[PDB]
Amino acid sequence: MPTIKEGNSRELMGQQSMPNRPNYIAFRDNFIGLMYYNSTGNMGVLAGQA
Amino acid sequence: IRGVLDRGPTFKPYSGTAYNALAPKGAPNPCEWD
Amino acid sequence: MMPQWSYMHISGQDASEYLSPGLVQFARATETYFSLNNKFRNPTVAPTHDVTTDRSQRLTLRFIPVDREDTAYSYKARFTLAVGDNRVLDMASTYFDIRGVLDRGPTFKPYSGTAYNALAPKGAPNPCEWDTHVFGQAPYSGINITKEGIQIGKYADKTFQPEPQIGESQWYETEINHAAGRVLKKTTPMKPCYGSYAKPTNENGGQGILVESQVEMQFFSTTNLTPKVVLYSEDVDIETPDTHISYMPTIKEGNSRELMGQQSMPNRPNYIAFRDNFIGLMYYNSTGNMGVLAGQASQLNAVVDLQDRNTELSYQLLLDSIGDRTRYFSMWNQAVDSYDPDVRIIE
Amino acid sequence: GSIPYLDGTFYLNHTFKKVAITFDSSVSWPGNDRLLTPNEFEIKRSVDGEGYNVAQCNMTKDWFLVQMLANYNIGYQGFYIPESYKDRMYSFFRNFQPMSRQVVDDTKYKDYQQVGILHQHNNSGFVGYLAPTMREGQAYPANFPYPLIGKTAVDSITQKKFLCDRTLWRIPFSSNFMSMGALTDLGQNLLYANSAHALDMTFEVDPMDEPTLLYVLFEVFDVVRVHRPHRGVIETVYLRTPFSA
Amino acid sequence: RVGNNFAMEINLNANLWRNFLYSNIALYLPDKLKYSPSNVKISDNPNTYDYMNKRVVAPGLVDCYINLGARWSLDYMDNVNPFNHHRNAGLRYRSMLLGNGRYVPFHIQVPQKFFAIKNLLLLPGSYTYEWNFRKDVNMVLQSSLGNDLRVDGASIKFDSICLYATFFPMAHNTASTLEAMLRNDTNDQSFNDYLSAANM
Amino acid sequence: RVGNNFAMEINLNANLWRNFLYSNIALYLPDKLKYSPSNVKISDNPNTYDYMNKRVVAPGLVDCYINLGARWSLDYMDNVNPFNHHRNAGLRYRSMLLGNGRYVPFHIQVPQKFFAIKNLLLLPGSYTYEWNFRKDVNMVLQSSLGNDLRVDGASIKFDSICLYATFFPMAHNTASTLEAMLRNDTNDQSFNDYLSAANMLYPIPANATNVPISIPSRNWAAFRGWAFTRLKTKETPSLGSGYDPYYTYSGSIPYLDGTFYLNHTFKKVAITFDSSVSWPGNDRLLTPNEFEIKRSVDGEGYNVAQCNMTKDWFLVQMLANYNIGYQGFYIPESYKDRMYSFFRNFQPMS
Amino acid sequence: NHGTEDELPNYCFPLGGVINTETLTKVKPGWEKDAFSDKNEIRVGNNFAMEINLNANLWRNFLYSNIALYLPDKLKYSPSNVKISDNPNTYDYMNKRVVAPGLVDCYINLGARWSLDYMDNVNPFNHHRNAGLRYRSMLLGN
Amino acid sequence: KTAVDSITQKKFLCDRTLWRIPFSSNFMSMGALTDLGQNLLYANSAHALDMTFEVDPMDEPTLLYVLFEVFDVVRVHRPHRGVIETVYLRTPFSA
Amino acid sequence: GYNVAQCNMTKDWFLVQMLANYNIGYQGFYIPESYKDRMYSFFRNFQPMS
Amino acid sequence: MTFEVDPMDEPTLLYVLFEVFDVVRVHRPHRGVIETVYLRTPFSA
């Protein structure tokens, strides 16, 4: 940025552009985190109705 | 499971640009000023 | 102990013994199409007696040489390898720990290219002076040029200012009226920019030789008289530790317009190190420098070598047969010699 | 980002200095004069203890021995590359990377000069200043870095270290550190069954300018027995020892 | 044209090498080695993408002449999570699995990992199977920069969850026989957790 | 701006390819193809780095249009040690193991290789263990250029050498019992050298083409067979002594390391017992009187695998290495085809 | 398509490292001319430079060479003022038909792992990057 | 369409390996101790051996390296504390 | 809903192919052992895209 | 422990001696054999 001054000017002709940092986003390996485990408050359940 | 996901605005699955990649990084677009 | 252990299968019988016979049979018969193996645990219990000592005992011992003899082209080391009572030693578990100093010499160059001005064209020259002409650059744009040099706020510190690293930020013509640069005196041999190096003489990066800074400004103008440019001339300890001249325009000493055309080229890469598996370090198959392994009580040498034998190679071939020579193992300098297939055979 | 605690993307194993294990406030484990430095597990040594190091890095002979045995039972009959099927992704060896390099000796190189980025020049006139921007400056003999090679190489100093990512440091509760069964020899010793013991551990780590955690896994038996006596009836018996829940 | 032609020089190889260093190492350098840009608005939140993306870093930090001829990891990078990177093949692939776009309708299959039930052979009867799923983006999602997805606008909504189960079309007489056997305590199933440890 | 912009053209790909050829092949070309630079001082010693570094080579020798569309090794480079190169990963790694600097304080662990003691289980007692270590840089060190390290300033000094030994903390009763058993001759340990061979070297004068060898009548019981290669005298230090004054080379040493690279220079082999009997004789081979390694055009028909190797030879090598040959030819199982094996290293070209 | 690592700019410079020098005269200190020579060349400001995106270029060349040219004929067009065979099963034909690089440019399906829907039904084996065929070809010679 | 009259060249490389000629009746590996090596004709008497190698010419001194495959063995005896006795046997080609 | 593996393939089909090629399917889905997953095999050649 | 001291215009040190038993037991079973047993309590090394 050649100037913190708004509006188009000969000055801005010298501004330089640079690509944004790559940023991958996705679900985790083996869906880690999706299901709760080892948490007393959100404990899974497997029981015979009987 | 089926649902919807919005990776948000910070998601950028690549390096570099998709626009005017061959243009020198300081070269300007044909413009006009006061 | 006991109870919970057997019940939980932490110990005790194997599934084959604890499960009912019908099930075992069934399991064996269904195996290829429907497996039950992973739903029954099989305990693994380590032995509790007659394996290890309860007594105090070192796992590793270190022996100091009893006699040493540092000679012209060799080194002899003698030890008293002692195997205590109630002990056994597997020779494969022995090795000579060595400490020393090594100078790879001046021809060692662990890389290709240069470490200095790699981006500079191979023929481009450093701003210089000769017999007196000048060929330079003034990238620094100052406020004004006085007899005190170039104003930067507050004149510049000759020892390091201006800094060659600094130039103008824009890409277009701004029109610099008060320019400053850095230049080498005709007393500093000419060398291409590429590969050019000169040790700094001050915490600020200045490389000006100290006598005692000897920097001297030189003012310049075009064709009322007012210097448009000023250069900070100096003598540096110019070197070219990793490149050489690819093009000498004249076998004539001294700086000249001629030398402006010399070309620089990186020196050939040259790796130097110990050999694969420390080959060569120890003597083998040499009657004159024969190893020794003898009982102090027998004094008879268990080692009997021949010039006819090839221990080093034998070991090379032995390794290949028992593992993947492609893997590296720092401990023994186990890193096989290879080459790029694309280099040996051009495709 | 990655969550090592859950995914195994471990990367801070090289920061451990040593480990001292003590039972009942007085007894040193494993004691028995086993290790070169019997009173504790020394993971790495700094220059002063070079002689006790191995593999061309700052790791100690003692530690290398324990890790090799614990992971592959290799150690008493020579050291060699473990068989590939035993050397997995999260294994010791496969992840072990010893490194070395040389740097100017600031205290012995007569002409030494401490020059920072602000004043370093190399490629001046062809590169942007303190940024990935447009070129600026002018051609000029570089003033950095110092030559470590050639007839002019500067007095240097050697640095050794190592990386050991995506693995866990191991100290088996086995008399010879070897794997002779899930249910170890020590784990079955009367001295550990006929009575209760207190345990003290002391870790020495490299300092980090940020809050960290020392993650300890106490290896035990975490088992379940499933009973299914009747239609729609599942009964379970959990047992975790040691460290019963 | 009298003489040689007009020519411009460039060091291809040096350039490439440089670009690799700057892109892969420099930019991942710790924040402490970085500095804020002039005349450019930047977030106050360091856990932000804007922040990580605007902080500037000097290439001279990791230039082509860095530790020349050595096989050395930067002492600055040793304690930096190596996995949070654009060169993480695993994460890269998982990202592409979803697509190249911000907005994604998803369909996935999640496995049961709990050791006591993961390999269990369930006998006939009716069972209540219930589980909890996280909604926290910082937990369910992963980024290469490791920025704060909560602040950073990531979002996730669960539309439907089903339970699938496949059955070996076992012969009835056989299945029945196997059942009887598995109903005896002597033939009780048993499992242990692979990790087998108390975590502290 | 009226019209298109100002532009400069460059062939990126061609350039890269070129740079690769010049750097990796050209510069390694034999000295004979090189020439001295004008107005530039250069050493008189060809075994010198200065020399190897200053000799200039024309890129046109190995330019991007070299043997276009072919998979061919340069006929000039065939007899050039392929291991002496900056692209030798093994050597490169060992070099970096030490660091990137000239001056290095070192700490290493050296293994015992001698076959009679390397795996021996030593019983209780006190033993005298002594060994000799070389100091010769051309021997202990290795360079990619293979220059003369003696002349070239390499130096090495041994400060201290220790002996380490690890012991299984075996139960005393057990250890004692094992000892007793191992003390009986019936339980004597035994080892054999992996190589299992008597090694001989016979000189081949420059330009010589015939190499006759004679072995005075002797006993052959238990004889296993023959194995052979060809080495360069320059790359073979003399081992019949503690020091070789004429050894001015520091590259790979095939005789010791296995970096063999001259096997393609063999034409044929004739074996004869008692001045009259041809082995194997019996009318076994296509050219029964000898082992023909390769044929030149005139004998095409007897060649195989799309190269100049003979059917006979291919058959022998395949059998000898993998027992493959009587029941068809096929790629040997990977575990049998190792690093120093025949097939894995066989490269036919045209 | 993970893009390109083109963060740093790439430049090419003049052989002499400077080309737009301006003739100057040395001066002495209120100043007086010096007579050093009457004509010294000094470059005032930065050097002359040309920019190029190395990485983007390489990536492009790869796309055009490996995918574009293999695109189906239907996406192609005949060149102007250039004789071309009538036989589509001909080499001349396949070699002259022209294809627009914009079809498979560096910004194609950015950030995705996707095979072109156009190429799915195109025999993947008929290609210069078929190692097996390449090797068999070289086995015979060049 | 303009290619010049050509000629074909074939060769081969076979680096980092040793040429082999086993002393076996069918060249196969049927045991360390070969069938021929145990033939009465090679035991009941001594024989002289002549070998003739033909190689490509090289403008530099070289060496023909021959490995005579045999048995290179040792038997270790340890009758008493601090006593190591060995028996070396190399055949053929006894030292 | 009837699709699987993050592509347009059906659960049914994925099941049949896995069983037919490696007998994998009734006791969970997992990557087949390399020696069973050859050049012309199902899994090794399966590429789901989005 | 909390110490209160007079202020000094220079960096100083508070030197604390933790009184314990620092002992050794020497065993000399055979010719040229010295075995030792060190024990420091409290504050074991």
3-state secondary structure F223-257: CCEEEEEEEEHHHCCCCCCCCCCCCCCCCCCHHHH
CA nearest to C268, candidates E112, F86, G116: F86
Chain E residues whose beta carbon lies within 8 Å of the beta carbon of residue B3: 105-106, 156-160
Characterise D51 by phi-psi region: left (phi > 0), alpha (psi -120 to 50), beta (else). Answer: alpha
Token couple for C192: 């291409």
- H10-42 burial, b at 16+ Cβ within 10 Å, e below that, comes to bbbbbbbbbbbbbbbeebbeeeeebebbeeeeb
Burial of F345 (0-12, 13-18, 19+ CB in 10 A): middle
Nearest chain D CA: its distance from F126 CA (Å): 20
Instruction: Answer yes or no: do E108 and I6 touch at CB < 8 A.
Output: yes
Compute the distance between CA of residue E73 and CA of residue E29 in angstroms, rounded to an integer. 12
Dihedral sign (CA D88, D89, D91, D92): positive
**DSSP type of residue F128:** E
Q: Do G7 and A22 touch (CB under 8 A)?
A: no
Q: In 3-state terms, what secondary structure has residue F25?
A: coil
Instruction: Using alpha carbons, select from G6, A4, B15 the residue that is nearest to residue E37.
Output: A4
Q: What is the interface size between D and E, counted as CB pairs within 8 Å?
A: 135
DSSP bridge partners of F170: C52
CA angle E120, E123, E127 (to 5 degrees): 85
- Cis? peptide before C106, omega within 30° of 0: no
Rounded to whole angstroms, the Cα distance separating A16 from D233 reads 71
**What method did the depositors use to determine the structure?**
cryo-EM
Question: What is residue G25's three-state secondary structure?
Answer: strand
Residues from chain I that touch C35, judged by Cβ atoms under 8 A, are 27
What sign does the dihedral C173-C179-C185-C186 (CA atoms) show? Answer: positive
* Cβ-defined contact of J45 to D26 (cutoff 8 Å): no
Which among F9, F8, F10, F26 is positioned nearest to F64, based on CA atoms?
F26
Q: Could you tell me the two tokens for D175? A: 């008399």
Whether residue E125 contacts residue A50, with contact meaning beta carbons closer than 8 Å, is answered with yes
Enclosing H/E stretch for J24: strand J21-27
Give the helix/strand (H/E) hosting J28.
Answer: none
Q: Are B10 and A23 in contact (CB under 8 A)?
A: yes
Measured between CB atoms, does H86 come within 8 Å of chain C? yes
Q: Which residues pair with F163 in a beta bridge?
A: C63, C96
Query: Which domain, by its residues, includes D28?
Result: 1-96+163-219
- CA distance linking residue E47 with residue E34, whole number of Å: 15
The answer to whether F113 contacts chain D (CB < 8 Å) is no
Q: Where do runs of H (alpha helix) occur along F117-216?
A: 137-140, 172-182
- R_g of chain D, CA atoms, integer Å: 26
- Quote the CA–CA distance of A21 and A34 in Å, as a whole number: 27
Encode burial over E132-165: b for 16+ CB neighbours within 10 A, e otherwise.
eeeeebbbbbbbbbbbbbebbebebeeeeeeeee
One DSSP character per residue, chain D reads ---HHHH-----GGGEEEEEEEETTTEEES-TT-SSSTTSEE-B--STTGGGB-TTSSBBHHHHHHHHHHHHS-SBTB--PPPTTTS-TT-HHHHEEEEEEEEE-TTT-TT-----GGG--SSTTTB-SSSSS--BS----B--S---SSTT---EEEEEEEEE-S------SSTTS--S-SB-SGGG-HHHHSS---EEEEEEE---SS------EEE-EEEEEEE--STT--EEEEEEESS--
Q: How many CB atoms lie within 10 A of CB F136?
A: 20
Helix, strand, coil percentages (3-state) for chain H, rounded to 5, are 5, 40, 50
Q: Where are the beta strands (DSSP E) in H4-95?
A: 11-14, 19-22, 47-55, 62-69, 71-77, 85-91
Q: Quick check: G24 and C221 in contact, CB under 8 A?
A: yes
- Inter-chain residue contact G106 with B21, CB threshold 8 Å: yes
Q: What are phi and psi of D149, to 5 degrees?
A: -130, 170
F210–chain H Cβ distance below 8 A for any pair: yes
Q: Within 13 Å and on the Cβ side, how many CA atoms surround D82?
A: 20
Residue B32, exposed/middle/buried by CB under 10 A (0-12, 13-18, 19+)?
A: exposed
Backbone dihedral angles phi then psi of residue I43, each to the nearest 5 degrees? -50, -55
| Helices G54-66 + F12-24 axis angle, to 10 | 100
The letter for the amino acid at F19 is N
For C17, nearest residue in chain E (alpha carbons): E186
Closest residue by Cα to residue G100 from G74, G69, G122, G123: G69
CA distance D75 to D70: 9
Tally of CA atoms within 13 A in the half-sphere of D203 that contains its CB? 11
Q: CA nearest F61: which of F27, F36, F94, F16?
A: F27
Tell me if E174 sits within 8 A of B24, measured CB to CB.
Answer: no
What are the CA-CA distances from residue E59 to residues D206, E18, F117, F119 (Å)? 28, 8, 55, 53
Q: Of J40, J36, J45, which Cα lies nearest the Cα of J20?
A: J40
Set of chain D residues whose Cβ sits within 8 Å of the Cβ of F162 = 51
CA triple H68-H72-H77, angle to 5 deg: 170
Quick one: CA torsion of E92, E97, E103, E106, rounded to 10 degrees? -140
Q: Nearest by CB to H67, from F126, F197, F218: name it.
A: F197
Interchain CB distance below 8 Å, C169 and A13: no
Question: Among D79, D70, D97, which Cα is nearest to D179's?
Answer: D70
Could you tell me the CA-to-CA distances from B14 to B18, B26, D4 in Å, in that order?
9, 21, 25
Q: Is B19 exposed, middle or buried, given 0-12, 13-18 or 19+ CB atoms closer than 10 A?
A: exposed
Choose, out of E6, E12, E72, the residue to mutate when testing the contact with F (most F CBs < 10 Å).
E12
Q: Report d(CA G47, CA C139) in Å as an integer.
A: 8
Helix, strand, or coil (residue F15): helix
Residue type, F121: L
Here the tokens at position C42 are 């099989």
Asked if omega into H92 is within 30° of 0 (cis), the reply is yes
Min Cα distance A10 → chain C (Å) is 10
**Which of the residues E34, E63, E86 would you substitute to probe the D interface, choosing the one with the greatest number of D C-beta atoms within 10 Å?**
E63
DSSP letter assigned to residue F220: -
- Domain CATH number, residue D16: 2.70.9.10
Q: Which of E57, E52, E72, E61 is nearest to E151 (CA)?
A: E52
Residue I13 exposure: Cα atoms within 13 Å on the Cβ side: 11
Backbone angles phi, psi at B20, to 5 degrees: 50, 50
Rg (CA), chain A: 27
Question: Helix, strand, or coil here: E181?
Answer: helix
Alpha-carbon distance of F166 to H93, in angstroms, equals 37
> How close does chain C come to G86, measured CA to CA in Å?
35
Summary count for chain E: helices (H), strands (E): 5, 7
Identify the architecture of domain F197-346 in CATH. Answer: Distorted Sandwich (2.70)
Cα distances (Å, whole numbers) of residue E114 to A35, A36, D218, E194, H11: 10, 10, 19, 10, 62
Give the position of tokens 């986003």: A25
For residues C171 and A12, the answer to whether their CB atoms sit within 8 Å is no
Q: Is G56 on the interface with B (CB under 8 A)?
A: yes
The answer to whether E61 touches D117, Cβ cutoff 8 Å, is yes
The strand pair at C179-184 and C229-234 is best described as parallel
Check if the beta carbon of residue F232 is closer than 8 Å to that of residue H63: yes
| Rounded-to-integer distance, Cα G19 and Cα E161, Å | 70
Q: In 3-state terms, what secondary structure has residue G10?
A: coil
Residue the block writes with tokens 């949070």: E84
d(CA F88, CA F251): 11
Residues 1-34 (B) with a CB less than 8 A from some CB of E: 1-11, 13-15
Reduce the DSSP state of residue G73 to 3 states and report it.
Answer: helix
What does DSSP say about strands F346-349 and G22-28: parallel, antiparallel, or unpaired? unpaired
Laid out side by side, the sheet with E103-107 consists of: E103-107, B2-6, E155-160
Q: Which helix (H) or strand (E) holds F109?
A: strand F103-111
Distance in angstroms (rounded) separating the CA atoms of residues C114 and D147: 11
- Partner-chain contact D6 A47, CB within 8 Å: no
Torsion angle of the four alpha carbons F141, F144, F149, F155, in this order, in degrees rounded to the nearest 10:
-50
Residue in chain H nearest C337 by alpha carbon: H16
Token pair, residue F186, equals: 């019936």
Which stretch of DSSP H or E encloses residue F197? strand F197-204
Q: What is the 3-state secondary structure (H, E, C) of chain C?
A: CHHHHHHCCCCCCCHHHHCCHHHHHHHHHHCCCCCCHHHCCCCCECCCCCCECCCCCCCEEEECCCEEEECCCEEEEEEEEEECCCCCEEHHHEEEEEEEEEECCCCCECCCCCCCCCCCCCCCECCEEECCEEEEEECEECCCEECCEEECCCECCCCCCCCCCCCCCCCCCCCCCCEEEEEECCCCCCCECCCCEECCCCCCCCCECECCECCEEEEEECCCCCCCEEEEEECECEECCCEEEEECCCCCCCCCHHHHHCEEEECCCECEEECHHHCCCECCCCHHHCCEEEECCCCCCCCCCCCCCCHHHHHHHHHHHHCCCCCCEHHHCECCCCCCHHHHCEC
Cα D226 from Cα E186, distance rounded (Å): 11
| Structure token pair of residue C319 | 């390794």
CA pair distance F191, H88, nearest whole angstrom: 10
Question: What values do phi and psi take at C343, rounded to 5?
Answer: -95, -40
Resolution (A): 10.0
Q: How far apart are CA J40 and CA J21, in angstroms?
A: 5
> How close is the nearest chain E Cα to the Cα of C271, in Å?
9
Whole-angstrom distance between the N-terminal and C-terminal Cα of chain D? Answer: 32
Q: Which residue has the tokens 């064209």?
A: C121
Rg over CA atoms, chain F: 27
* C135:G40 CB<8 A: yes
Q: Which helix (H) or strand (E) holds F337?
A: none
Give me the sign of the Cα torsion angle F280, F283, F288, F294. Answer: negative
**F108/D34 Cβ within 8 A:** no
Query: C112: closest CA among F30, D142, F147, E13?
Result: E13
How far apart CA D69 and CA F169 sit, in angstroms, is 13
Touch test H–E: 3 Cβ pairs or more under 8 Å: no
Cβ atoms of F315 and F324 within 8 Å: the answer is: no
Contact E93, A29 (CB under 8 A): no
CB atoms within 10 A of CB C30: 15
Cβ-defined contact of C89 to F167 (cutoff 8 Å): yes
Kind and range of the H or E run holding F13: helix F12-24
Q: Are B13 and A20 a contacting pair at CB < 8 A?
A: no
Sign, CA torsion E11/E17/E21/E22: positive
Q: Residue E96: how many CA atoms within 13 Å on its side-chain side?
A: 20
